[PDB]
Amino acid sequence: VETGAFDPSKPVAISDFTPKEGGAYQKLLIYGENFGTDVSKVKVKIGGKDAIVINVKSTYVYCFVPSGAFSGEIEITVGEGENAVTTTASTTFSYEKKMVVGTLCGYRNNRDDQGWRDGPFDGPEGVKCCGFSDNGRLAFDPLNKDHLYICYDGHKAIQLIDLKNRMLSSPLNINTIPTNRIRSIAFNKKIEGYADEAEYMIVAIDYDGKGDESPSVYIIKRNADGTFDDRSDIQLIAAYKQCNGATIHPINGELYFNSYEKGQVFRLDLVDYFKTIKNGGSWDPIVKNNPNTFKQLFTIADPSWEFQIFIHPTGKYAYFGVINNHYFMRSDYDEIKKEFITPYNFVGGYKQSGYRDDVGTEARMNNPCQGVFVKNPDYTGEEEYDFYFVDRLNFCVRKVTPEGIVSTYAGRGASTSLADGNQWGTDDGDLREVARFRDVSGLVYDDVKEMFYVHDQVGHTIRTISMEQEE
Amino acid sequence: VETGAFDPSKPVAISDFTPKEGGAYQKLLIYGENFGTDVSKVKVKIGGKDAIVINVKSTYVYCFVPSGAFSGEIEITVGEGENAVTTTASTTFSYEKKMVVGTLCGYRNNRDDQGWRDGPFDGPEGVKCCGFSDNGRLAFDPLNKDHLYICYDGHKAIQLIDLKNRMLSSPLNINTIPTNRIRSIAFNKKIEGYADEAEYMIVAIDYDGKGDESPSVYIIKRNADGTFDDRSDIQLIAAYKQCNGATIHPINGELYFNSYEKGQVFRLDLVDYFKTIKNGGSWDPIVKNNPNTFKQLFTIADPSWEFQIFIHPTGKYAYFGVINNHYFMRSDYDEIKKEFITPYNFVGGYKQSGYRDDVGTEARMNNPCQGVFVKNPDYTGEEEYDFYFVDRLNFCVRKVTPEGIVSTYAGRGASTSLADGNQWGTDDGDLREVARFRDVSGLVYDDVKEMFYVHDQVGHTIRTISMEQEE
Ligand SMILES: [Cl-]
Ligand SMILES: [Cl-]
Ligand SMILES: [Cl-]
Ligand SMILES: [Cl-]
Ligand SMILES: [Zn+2]
Ligand SMILES: [Zn+2]
Ligand SMILES: [Zn+2]
Ligand SMILES: [Zn+2]
Ligand SMILES: [Zn+2]
Ligand SMILES: [Zn+2]
Ligand SMILES: [Zn+2]
Ligand SMILES: [Zn+2]
Ligand SMILES: [Zn+2]
Ligand SMILES: [Zn+2]
Ligand SMILES: [Zn+2]
Ligand SMILES: [Zn+2]
Ligand SMILES: [Zn+2]
Ligand SMILES: [Zn+2]
Ligand SMILES: [Zn+2]
Ligand SMILES: [Zn+2]
């Protein structure tokens, strides 16, 4: 062989590589000897995973770090058959793990005829659980994050996704609720003299069968054994019409709920409710007849405005997600009055659906659904959180900084959307290169395990976003 | 007056505001009393600067924090004439200063007939200095950052911008150089036994008047009094043809220079040069006849490739800015051989001019010129720098992260480009809302004062990017 050509009678050596650490898709430069000058004659594995070889030039090889290369062991084989020579680098590459999309439970077969079935997360079709097909919202039991509840707009049971025993059940059949349009789940904060922390599940429903005296919000009391099920006491706490959600202030504990009719936002101090029942009184849930107790703070925009309220963990502000008109508004909280004030347009285009990462009202989204605040360790001032939400008709999770910069966090996998031409899909893995979702409606974040659970309504699955693990 | 209306017989009060700190363009919420409900009747000043009032609702006012509101004093006046009532908040807003574009020296009058004139940075037209009209490059004297040199492609003097005495001079008339196409300025690193740190200015020129034996690089020796001027010894160190720049490796000290002909990159160890002259030898600068001394490492792409070399402060890699074909390539440095290796496309589109912030080869630029590496305090690993370059025909400074994300750092002011419809201009101030440049060719960064100097070739000015200051 000539100068620079591969010599199969001599060893192949790796002397160094750079960078020494990195994540999947990182370009890696490997230095050594006897690599030859042809990509076709070189194969590289990193952490036991086959790696894409970019260029080979005698004393160096460029390749891409593969997903899941945990061990960082670098192995190279030059030549083929009788002439193949292999070596392994003496030091390991330091693989930096990334968040990845996974699938927890649920499935959709080729005929989409699996239906609904309670049971184990895993097993053969016919045994493993499935359903999850109506638009939904997620909420953890604040006293036990192994218990993840899901409510649905179109399925009249609130289900329990039990992460510890890996079982799906339907403990809440809410038979007295007059509709299957269940919109949200919240829990009370402790109320001195009246209610322990999360003793009550607060459930919003979307109904207008009794005109403007139609139920909006119910309250369900935890059983003596700690469960929420059909033995639980359930009471009507507010009735107007067309409610799309109810949310609890994380510091002061009052309840905010709306009506789509004119986009009203109502404020209820639960102390009024518990004080009345404690003194053997009759509670009147008819909002219109009691303007001092169910205080109407404002209308956020125009009539027929469908939205939910997401309050910052400090309680100092909230985002109002306008599901049917494709934007979020922001509202500041007056800490002395203990009320939110008239909101203003924050991110997205007023009545203009689309998909565009940009700043403020130049960003575009399409049917924004559930959102959550997540601590960003890089923030050091008084603002410590970013906001993440499922953008339903764009099949992804978006991120919103406090300044209003909107980006795409997970979904619409670049490589997978090329293979089949669809921005939607079921692929697990790398957040923006591979992973895909179908219509996404629900989202929660476990702030201790540092992971998201996502309700993929049209995939009929519960997905996860969490740190990859060596199996 | 009714409930919520302004009452001119009562004081106006400010009780609180949020956020407590922030920068220009921040939305500020001011709480208080007696503000009325009309924006037309309210005026706000912050730090003595008039502020844009957004919304007024009796007990709160929303406004934008103005540029230059250093003192943070909040003053509000409600009403007019005899009914005007003013109050000042008892606590000050904490104004966070930002980088701003400024103009150091040079000017362009309405007839663009000021020409060239050495002298003071300030004064009346006819006295204050001007010129700066040919495409240029900037370089500090490594031993004195008060001395900023500028060389020009089309003006046969190298000028001194003396930041201490605020005077422009022309100390280097380089009479023996055969052209006015001066392309770059560099300085040697200390060479044990031969040359002290920055004892020599290394100057690249663009010439082909003697075919392939045409001068490319000269070396100019510092005078006994520390100056570089017409008393300085000047020698030809390399001659091929069509050189576009020469750069010194910041750790090992060797010299890299190119030729546009085939896009060659040549490597010269200056020790060879000084050893020859020290021993009473004759130095032969003809590159073609001495392939072992002027080592040709590679050709970077196709023929007729105009580019400069920008080496990372660690010396571990370099970016090659292809001026005439609108992209940057990246080259890794082999620390054992002490040579760069064949480069690869990094950011921008190969032969595709444009303006687009994006990742890698999806980004678009137009005539990328001088670039500099700048430490980012947020980076904690082995990579501590970002890269900034002047994108000439896009009238701005762009930023390139090590991963290849290209953004716009300064220029193309949003508000000013609306007023007149031009992306170019002369405005000073806010980096992306107001400031504008015309064609930009030169760029340096003082890593101690934390400021950039920019050569705005068509504005005929030297601009600054630095922290705003209370005058
Ligand atoms: Cl072979
Ligand atoms: Cl929706
Ligand atoms: Cl008035
Ligand atoms: Cl140019
Ligand atoms: Zn090495
Ligand atoms: Zn080949
Ligand atoms: Zn159902
Ligand atoms: Zn359980
Ligand atoms: Zn109790
Ligand atoms: Zn009635
Ligand atoms: Zn207040
Ligand atoms: Zn825009
Ligand atoms: Zn206050
Ligand atoms: Zn008015
Ligand atoms: Zn001139
Ligand atoms: Zn001086
Ligand atoms: Zn000396
Ligand atoms: Zn000759
Ligand atoms: Zn080497
Ligand atoms: Zn793209």
Domain ranges of chain A: 12-96, 100-466
* Nearest listed ligand to the Cα of residue A1: 1
Q: How many angstroms separate the CA of residue A102 from the nearest CA in chain B?
A: 26
Quote the CA–CA distance of B311 and B267 in Å, as a whole number: 14
**Nearest CB neighbour to A342, from listed B21, B57, B378:** B57
Name the CATH superfamily, with its identifier, for domain B12-96.
Immunoglobulins (2.60.40.10)
Who's near B44: CB < 8 A, 6+ residues apart?
Answer: B30, B50, B51, B53, B61, B63, B74, B75, B76, B77
> If DSSP codes are grouped into helix, strand and coil, which group holds residue B419?
helix
Question: CA B128 to CA B106: how far, in whole Å?
Answer: 8
A311 contacts A340 by C-beta, under 8 angstroms: no
Q: Which residue has the tokens 């104004």?
A: B95
Give the three-state DSSP class for B417. helix
- Report the 10 Å Cβ neighbour count for A246: 27
Q: If you measure from the C-alpha of residue B33 to the centroid of ligand 11, how many angstroms do you get, rounded to a whole number?
A: 9
The CATH number of the domain covering residues in B100-466: 2.120.10.30
CA of B37 to the centre of ligand 14 (A): 5
**How many other β-carbons are positioned within 10 Å of the β-carbon of residue A363?**
24
Q: Which residues of B touch A19 (CB under 8 A)?
A: 382
Determination technique for this entry? X-ray
Nearest-angstrom CA–CA distance, B155 and B442: 15
A356: Cβ contacts below 8 Å, ≥ 6 apart: A362, A363, A364
Please give the Cα distance from A227 to A447 (Å, whole number).
Answer: 23
Q: Are A360 and A402 in contact (CB under 8 A)?
A: no
B271 burial via Cβ count (<10 Å: 0-12, 13-18, 19+)? middle
Which residues of B line the annotated binding site for Zn(2+)? 16, 38, 147, 155, 162, 196, 199, 213, 334
B122 three-state secondary structure: coil
Structure tokens at A286: 């008819």
Contact A265, A322 (CB under 8 A): no
| Closest CB from B21, B29, B332 relative to A332 | B29
Amino acid at B256: Y
Whole-number Cα distances in Å, A331 to A160, A254, A388, A390, B29: 32, 16, 17, 20, 11
Task: Return the ∠ at Cα A83 (arms to A82 and A88), rounded to 5°.
Answer: 110
Resolution (A): 1.8
Is omega for the bond preceding B19 within 30 degrees of 0, making it cis?
Answer: yes
User: B154 with B125: CB under 8 angstroms?
Assistant: no
Q: What is the Cα–Cα distance from B465 to A52, expressed in whole angstroms?
A: 42
> What is the Å distance from ligand 1's center to A42 Cα?
10
**Taking CB atoms and an 8 Å limit, are B55 and A19 in contact across chains?**
no
A161 and A131 in contact (C-beta within 8 Å)? no
Taking Cα atoms as reference points, which of B396, B374, B375 lies closest to residue B441?
B396
Distance from the alpha carbon of residue B30 to the mean position of ligand 11, in angstroms: 10
Instruction: Return the closest-CA partner of residue B103 out of B441, B397, B436, B423.
Output: B436
Are the beta carbons of A461 and A103 closer than 8 angstroms?
A: yes
Judged by CB atoms closer than 8 Å, whether chains meet at B382 and A19 is answered as yes
Buried b (16+ CB within 10 A) or exposed e, B436-450: bbbbbbbbbbeeeee
CA B272 distance to own-chain centroid? 34
Residue carrying the six token digits 């079982």: A167
Q: How far is C-alpha A367 from the chain's CA centre?
A: 15
**Nearest residue in chain A measured CA to CA from B54:** A344
Name residues 375-434 of chain B within 8 A of A (Cβ).
378, 381-382
Ligand 2 centre and the CA of A81: distance in Å?
Answer: 58
Angle at A296 between CA A292 and CA A298, to 5 degrees: 150
Query: Which residues in chain B have Cβ-Cβ distances shorter than 8 Å to A21?
Result: 381
Task: Note which residues in 37-66 of chain A have CB less than 8 A from chain B.
Answer: 55, 57, 60, 62
User: Partners of B261 in the beta sheet?
Assistant: none
Q: Which of B20, B31, B332 sits opposite A29 (nearest CB)?
A: B332
